[PDB]
# Entry
Amino acid sequence: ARTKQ
Amino acid sequence: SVNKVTCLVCRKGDNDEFLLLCDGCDRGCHIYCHRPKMEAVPEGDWFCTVCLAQQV
Ligand SMILES: [Zn+2]
Ligand SMILES: [Zn+2]
# Structure
């Protein structure tokens, strides 16, 4: 999963 | 989109590196707002509550 960063 | 994503729980878009993005839609959630406890960003795919409701 990834982040908004 | 992505700079516009906000947390489903607290509704803020700050603390980007903690702000988990749904793999099924444009929603997000801070790991620290999530319940039960999520200590770290997961390695696998993550689906929000809206996306889960679409599953069969
Ligand atoms: Zn939040
Ligand atoms: Zn979703």
User: Anything to note?
Assistant: The CA atoms of residues 30 and 36 of chain B lie 12 Å apart. The beta strands of chain B are 19-21, 28-30. The pocket of zinc ion (ligand 1) is lined by residues B 7, 9-10, 12, 30, 33 (CB under 6 Å).
